[PDB]
Design an enzyme around this catalytic site. Structure first.
Site, PDB file in Angstrom:
ATOM      1  N   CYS A 120       0.805  -1.222   0.000  1.00 54.67           N
ATOM      2  CA  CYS A 120       0.000   0.000   0.000  1.00 54.67           C
ATOM      3  C   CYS A 120       0.841   1.278   0.000  1.00 54.67           C
ATOM      4  CB  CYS A 120      -0.969   0.012   1.207  1.00 54.67           C
ATOM      5  SG  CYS A 120      -2.083   1.473   1.246  1.00 54.67           S
ATOM      6  N   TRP A 292      -9.391   5.550  -0.840  1.00 62.72           N
ATOM      7  CA  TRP A 292      -9.668   6.222  -2.100  1.00 62.72           C
ATOM      8  C   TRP A 292      -8.620   5.781  -3.112  1.00 62.72           C
ATOM      9  CZ3 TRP A 292      -8.902   9.322   2.357  1.00 62.72           C
ATOM     10  CH2 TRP A 292      -7.674  10.008   2.450  1.00 62.72           C
TER      11      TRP A 292
HETATM   12  C1  HEM Z   1      -6.377   6.211   1.751  1.00 67.60           C
HETATM   13  C2  HEM Z   1      -6.226   5.794   0.466  1.00 67.60           C
HETATM   14  C3  HEM Z   1      -5.460   4.738   0.003  1.00 67.60           C
HETATM   15  C4  HEM Z   1      -4.651   4.752  -1.124  1.00 67.60           C
HETATM   16  C5  HEM Z   1      -4.489   5.854  -2.191  1.00 67.60           C
HETATM   17  C6  HEM Z   1      -4.079   3.423  -1.216  1.00 67.60           C
HETATM   18  C7  HEM Z   1      -3.515   3.006  -2.376  1.00 67.60           C
HETATM   19  C8  HEM Z   1      -3.257   1.712  -2.626  1.00 67.60           C
HETATM   20  C9  HEM Z   1      -2.710   1.248  -3.873  1.00 67.60           C
HETATM   21  C10 HEM Z   1      -2.269   2.033  -5.103  1.00 67.60           C
HETATM   22  C11 HEM Z   1      -2.600  -0.064  -3.717  1.00 67.60           C
HETATM   23  C12 HEM Z   1      -2.188  -0.986  -4.847  1.00 67.60           C
HETATM   24  C13 HEM Z   1      -3.358  -1.892  -5.173  1.00 67.60           C
HETATM   25  C14 HEM Z   1      -3.107  -2.810  -6.354  1.00 67.60           C
HETATM   26  O1  HEM Z   1      -2.134  -2.580  -7.113  1.00 67.60           O
HETATM   27  O2  HEM Z   1      -3.896  -3.766  -6.519  1.00 67.60           O
HETATM   28  C15 HEM Z   1      -3.000  -0.427  -2.375  1.00 67.60           C
HETATM   29  C16 HEM Z   1      -2.847  -1.684  -1.778  1.00 67.60           C
HETATM   30  C17 HEM Z   1      -3.234  -2.008  -0.481  1.00 67.60           C
HETATM   31  N1  HEM Z   1      -3.765  -1.100   0.439  1.00 67.60           N
HETATM   32 FE1  HEM Z   1      -3.951   0.766   0.218  1.00 67.60          FE
HETATM   33  N2  HEM Z   1      -4.481   2.588  -0.182  1.00 67.60           N
HETATM   34  C18 HEM Z   1      -5.377   3.389   0.540  1.00 67.60           C
HETATM   35  C19 HEM Z   1      -6.082   2.962   1.636  1.00 67.60           C
HETATM   36  C20 HEM Z   1      -5.996   1.748   2.261  1.00 67.60           C
HETATM   37  C21 HEM Z   1      -6.712   1.385   3.475  1.00 67.60           C
HETATM   38  C22 HEM Z   1      -7.718   2.281   4.178  1.00 67.60           C
HETATM   39  C23 HEM Z   1      -6.304   0.138   3.820  1.00 67.60           C
HETATM   40  C24 HEM Z   1      -6.681  -0.673   4.890  1.00 67.60           C
HETATM   41  C25 HEM Z   1      -7.143  -0.340   6.123  1.00 67.60           C
HETATM   42  C26 HEM Z   1      -5.339  -0.241   2.793  1.00 67.60           C
HETATM   43  C27 HEM Z   1      -4.709  -1.462   2.693  1.00 67.60           C
HETATM   44  C28 HEM Z   1      -4.007  -1.874   1.559  1.00 67.60           C
HETATM   45  C29 HEM Z   1      -3.594  -3.262   1.365  1.00 67.60           C
HETATM   46  C30 HEM Z   1      -3.611  -4.406   2.394  1.00 67.60           C
HETATM   47  C31 HEM Z   1      -3.147  -3.331   0.098  1.00 67.60           C
HETATM   48  C32 HEM Z   1      -2.719  -4.627  -0.560  1.00 67.60           C
HETATM   49  C33 HEM Z   1      -3.535  -5.058  -1.785  1.00 67.60           C
HETATM   50  C34 HEM Z   1      -3.189  -6.459  -2.263  1.00 67.60           C
HETATM   51  O3  HEM Z   1      -2.310  -7.117  -1.655  1.00 67.60           O
HETATM   52  O4  HEM Z   1      -3.817  -6.908  -3.243  1.00 67.60           O
HETATM   53  N3  HEM Z   1      -5.164   0.748   1.834  1.00 67.60           N
HETATM   54  N4  HEM Z   1      -3.429   0.692  -1.701  1.00 67.60           N
HETATM   55  N1  LIG Z   2      -7.304   1.104  -1.510  1.00 66.48           N
HETATM   56  C1  LIG Z   2      -7.108   1.298  -2.802  1.00 66.48           C
HETATM   57  N2  LIG Z   2      -6.915   2.530  -3.238  1.00 66.48           N
HETATM   58  N3  LIG Z   2      -7.085   0.272  -3.670  1.00 66.48           N
HETATM   59  O1  LIG Z   2      -6.982  -0.975  -3.225  1.00 66.48           O
HETATM   60  C2  LIG Z   2      -7.027  -1.918  -4.317  1.00 66.48           C
HETATM   61  C3  LIG Z   2      -7.953  -1.460  -5.454  1.00 66.48           C
HETATM   62  C4  LIG Z   2      -7.726  -2.126  -6.832  1.00 66.48           C
HETATM   63  N4  LIG Z   2      -6.334  -1.881  -7.317  1.00 66.48           N
HETATM   64  C5  LIG Z   2      -8.724  -1.559  -7.849  1.00 66.48           C
HETATM   65  O2  LIG Z   2      -8.295  -0.828  -8.768  1.00 66.48           O
HETATM   66  O3  LIG Z   2      -9.933  -1.843  -7.730  1.00 66.48           O
END
Ligand code: HEM
Ligand SMILES: N=C(N)NOCC[C@H](N)C(=O)O
Ligand code: HEM
Ligand SMILES: N=C(N)NOCC[C@H](N)C(=O)O
Ligand SMILES: [Zn+2]
Lengths: 416, 414
Positions: A120, A292
């Protein structure tokens, strides 16, 4: 010098040491012989289903360990409350086989799990998380209500707010609470007659699963799927989200007037719902979280991936680019205009979104913060760098150390 | 044991069994992954306090010999058994041994093939190996270098080549090329902390002046070479301007682009890595092929700590530099990479775009799967610096390991 991973920033020449990795208690996929660090699902991040309750001894240490992190966060390590809470945890595990968290502890671990997420890039917001306790939930119907409340709060009419809803934990000799869908909001993928897919090819299995469970299918590219919520030991029940609760954004381009006519769109709320939340050895099989989007998630991965909407060529044609030769960079030109479309459409509809530049720049700031606070930050480089313009962002030039810290969000098998 | 690898775009799966042949360790451990680290002090072949353990050298040697005879299919022949005898006999008495020209030619191609960070390994079998092991001075090194350049360049129709200088000997200095590449542009640290030319070359530019070079003051002044023969101070040699082919950058549609006075050399010849074959080490073995457009357009010209021309172009293009959301950076980068491809193509100088390159890498991965049962790749290096997911490699999981022969990093001779 120091006995810890030396990490360098090639853009700044700055150096740091990662001492935090010393805290990791969960093994990874790599060995000195080879790096299995580009594998999406190695069997080192995924938590297989435990048909039987975890060995009392192992649960105890994960729990004792979590409580320690908790008290250290409130600065009461070694205190009477700390030692009592420890005795209270083993007493409960001793007689029941498991234990329960206090309200403030759940909020802690949940924020901590997000904080520990290597993939993330939006972790600079880790402290700002609304934790909805839903451990009282006892029916699939109730799960639906909680989720609708989640979507309402989190969506907040385009001024999104990060939130997670924690449902009952895994209990021995009792089924799990599961949300069959990958995200709370997803588009249907219809397997055509000629072999192709109308909509989102990613969601093809869940789409057919909803149908087999009574869902009456539509035939559009952007049909929102219904939730297939499951309560302990019961088959999943189907629920349809009220259209007013699902905010969407019609995509248009700031200059290319024809982009609007393409009928492209995306939902404003990203809510992973198939991930397992692990806190002190306790497993929360259903605990959807949401924040978001970063622009590249929609405009590049979702819209341009070969195995997704694959709209690169259509846009290239509309732009009148030479799609016959690679050296024209028609794929690069189209993708830039598509991402610019996602950004423009969201900024217009007053819905929350962050571009890959601002996003990575803020993650660098998060990295400074974490260096001072914990002496490092577990980061998965391939996932932190945006799918486009990689070296144009500061994170590209930042070396990163990746490891697993608990609490954490782990992958888990599909309930079917 | 054998890593299950997957391609998420096609949903295909393969098991990498080639990793089982790795004998050298990387920076990773089960506690944490350091794969995104450019150069750990581990893999790097640093100097030594004497002669390598005969036992170890002999085993890496016997292994290599086994590889070579397997390659010509004579595995087991009398020629195979007698080459092992020669190597054993020579190691046991001299503490080292030497390689036959043919074996060295097999080693060098295999070194390239085993390079995890090279996206152009499909051309691995096509390599001109110049045996320069009969060198005894810096001057001879220079003549060999000019020969390599003239050949590789080939009036714009570039060809892959490698010149192999004398191996390393215990107790004696190293044949070394101080420059990281045969062709590089100077980096003059100006009064106000600013840097004229290429910042990545500020140190080496200074070393040349320290050794008597008369510097210019352009952004693209080709540097002279500092060649070093064992236990001797390096020498200064200026490359003949006719030998160094350069390409003036222009845009197919943006008339003003040319007015920026941008340009870049045609030949990418890395001269600071160490080539290890069968326990032997060649501290000086410059190799070259051809550029992939991103190396120049994205990295060299757009990196923050490099020429950093992104904003300038953005302004000429009259973009919204105010906010990041106007994607001005992405926009300028695409045009810069375009100008490179146009220019090198208009000038008839070999260049491959990241799309063509990665597609060929996918094909190579396939060939290697059948050939050796796997292919070591460093995902972060294989995936280009722009349009990552827009390329086939992004969606491919990769296994990374160390195979020998191998190009390794090594300390700077100063
Ligand atoms: C506040 C805005 C947030 C942004 C802009 C952000 C952005 C992202 C992005 C760009 C990814 C890559 C996802 C992908 O490539 O599939 C990601 C992954 C992730 N985010 Fe965030 N995130 C946000 C909020 C959160 C929140 C609120 C949580 C949890 C409480 C979180 C937990 C994670 C986790 C666990 C992943 C791993 C996804 C996976 O392993 O498939 N994120 N996030
Ligand atoms: N928390 C965020 N911003 N994204 O989490 C995963 C979203 C996924 N890459 C999608 O494009 O649906
Ligand atoms: C045929 C044309 C070739 C192309 C298009 C090509 C392209 C590339 C690219 C894009 C990289 C990454 C460079 C960087 O990011 O700095 C790379 C790395 C490398 N290539 Fe190739 N390559 C070619 C020929 C060669 C040859 C002839 C050899 C060896 C004899 C070779 C050996 C390597 C090695 C060892 C690296 C790693 C460089 C490093 O660690 O700094 N390549 N190549
Ligand atoms: N072998 C090739 N193509 N390049 O190797 C490295 C050259 C470096 N990227 C540069 O920009 O000079
Ligand atoms: Zn690793």
């Amino acid at each position: 010098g120091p006995k810890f991973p030396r990490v360098k920033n090639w853009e700044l020449g700055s150096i740091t040491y990662d001492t935090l990795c010393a805290q990791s208690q969960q093994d990874g996929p790599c060995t000195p012989r080879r790096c299995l660090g580009s594998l999406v699902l190695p069997r080192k991040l995924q938590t297989r289903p435990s048909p039987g309750p975890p060995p009392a001894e192992q649960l105890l240490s994960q729990a004792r360990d979590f409580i320690n992190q908790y008290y250290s966060s409130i600065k009461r390590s070694g205190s009477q409350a700390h030692e009592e809470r420890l005795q209270e945890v083993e007493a409960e595990v001793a007689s029941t086989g498991t234990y329960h968290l206090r309200e403030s502890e759940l909020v802690f671990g949940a924020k901590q799990a997000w904080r520990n997420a290597p993939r993330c890039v939006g972790r600079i917001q880790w402290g700002k998380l609304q934790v909805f306790d839903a451990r009282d939930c006892s029916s699939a119907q109730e799960m639906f209500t909680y989720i609708c409340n989640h979507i309402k709060y989190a969506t907040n009419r385009g001024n999104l707010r990060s939130a997670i809803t924690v449902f009952p934990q895994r209990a021995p000799g009792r089924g799990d609470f599961r949300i069959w869908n990958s995200q709370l909001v997803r588009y249907a993928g219809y397997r055509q007659q000629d072999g192709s897919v109308r909509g989102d090819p990613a969601n093809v299995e869940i789409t057919e699963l909803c149908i087999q469970h009574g869902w009456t299918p539509g035939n559009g590219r952007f049909d929102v799927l219904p939730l297939l919520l499951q309560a302990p030991d019961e088959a999943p029940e189907l629920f349809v989200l009220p259209p007013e609760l699902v905010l969407e954004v019609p995509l248009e381009h700031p200059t290319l007037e024809w982009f609007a006519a393409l009928g492209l769109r995306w939902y404003a709320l990203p809510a992973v719902s198939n991930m397992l939340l692990e806190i002190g050895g306790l497993e929360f099989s259903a605990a959807p979280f949401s924040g978001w989007y970063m622009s590249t998630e929609i405009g590049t991965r979702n819209l341009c991936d070969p195995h997704r909407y694959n709209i690169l060529e259509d846009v290239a044609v509309c732009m009148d680019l030479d799609t016959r030769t690679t050296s024209s960079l028609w794929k690069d030109k189209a993708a830039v205009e598509i991402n610019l479309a996602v950004l423009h459409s969201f900024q217009l509809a007053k819905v929350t979104i962050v571009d890959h530049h601002a996003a990575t720049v803020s993650f660098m700031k998060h990295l400074d913060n974490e260096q001072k606070a914990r002496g490092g930050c577990p980061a998965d480089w391939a996932w932190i760098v945006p799918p486009i313009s990689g070296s144009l962002t500061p994170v590209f030039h930042q070396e990163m150390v990746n490891y697993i810290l608990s609490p954490a969000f782990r992958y888990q098998p599909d309930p079917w």
